[PDB]
Amino acid sequence: AQKLVFFAEDAQKLVXED
Numbered sequence: 790a791q792k793l794v795f796f797a798e799d800a801q802k803l804v805x806e807d
């Protein structure tokens with residue numbers, strides 16, 4: 790399967806398999 794893992798910090802924190 791295709792995979793994605795995402796992490797972002799602006800605090801506003803943003804955290805994402807077919």
